[PDB]
Structures are given as structure tokens and as C-alpha cells.
Amino acid sequence: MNPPPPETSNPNKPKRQTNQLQYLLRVVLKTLWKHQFAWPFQQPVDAVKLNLPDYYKIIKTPMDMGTIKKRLENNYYWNAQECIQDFNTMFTNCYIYNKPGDDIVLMAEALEKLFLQKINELPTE
Numbered sequence: 001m002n003p004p005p006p007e008t009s010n011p012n013k014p015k016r017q018t019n020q021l022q023y024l025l026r027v028v029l030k031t032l033w034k035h036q037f038a039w040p041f042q043q044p045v046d047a048v049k050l051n052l053p054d055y056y057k058i059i060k061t062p063m064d065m066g067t068i069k070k071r072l073e074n075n076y077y078w079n080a081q082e083c084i085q086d087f088n089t090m091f092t093n094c095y096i097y098n099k100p101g102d103d104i105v106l107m108a109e110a111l112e113k114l115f116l117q118k119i120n121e122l123p124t125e
């Protein structure tokens with residue numbers, strides 16, 4: 001069974017646009033999205049479709065790149081660090097729900113490396 005997906009808007013949360021957040025969407029997210037290992041992470045985990053009935057018994061703060069993309073598009077974040085935290089949550093969730101060496105973990109490991117390469121240097125404000 002699936003919980004509601006994470007919010008992509010929140011009217012009482014303040015919005016912001018920064019050069020770094022623009023970069024996270026245009027360069028970081030959009031490039032990672034095209035990687036051959038991106039597909040499992042392009043939408044929230046569907047526990048019914050993927051037959052993972054224990055997924056949300058284990059993962060209590062789900063995150064995916066579809067959600068991140070919508071958050072960036074809606075200027076949901078206050079700063080780049082907040083967005084980076086969502087990417088890190090996504091990767092960590094994968095390591096938590098699975099085990100070292102699993103195919104899905106190998107995919108997350110590769111994406112995390114590419115992610116770190118890309119956020120090593122961000123534009124200046």
C-alpha cells in the first residue's frame with residue numbers, strides 16, 4: 001500500500017529562486033535524469049506496482065527525482081542545500097531498503113557519484 005507522495009507545494013512554506021537552485025534543475029537534475037540508471041528514481045516508489053509491500057514499512061521519508069523536479073519547478077526550496085538533502089535522502093533510502101551489491105544499489109551508487117561530481121562546484125549567488 002502506498003502513502004501519499006511527498007508534497008511538491010506548500011503555501012505556508014516560503015519560496016526562493018537562486019542561481020544554485022536554477023543550476024540544480026537545469027544541469028544537475030536534468031543531466032542525471034538522462035542516465036541509463038535513472039529510471040527507478042524518476043517517480044515515487046509504487047509498492048503495489050513493484051510488489052514491494054514492505055517498502056513503506058521500512059522507508060519513512062521517501063524521495064525521488066520526479067518529486068525533486070517538481071519542487072524545483074515550483075520554487076519550493078529555500079536554498080540549494082535543501083534540495084541536495086532530498087537527493088541524499090533518495091540515495092540513502094535505496095541503501096536502507098536494499099543490500100550491498102543489489103542491482104538497484106549499484107544503480108544508486110553510480111548516480112550518487114555523478115551527482116557529487118556535478119554539485120562539487122555550484123555557481124556563485
Ligand SMILES: O=c1[nH]c(-c2ccccc2F)cs1
Pocket residue numbers: 039040041045050093094097098104
Ligand atoms: O529502493 C528502490 N527499489 C526500486 C525498484 C525495485 C524493483 C523494481 C523497480 C524499482 F524501481 C526503486 S527504488
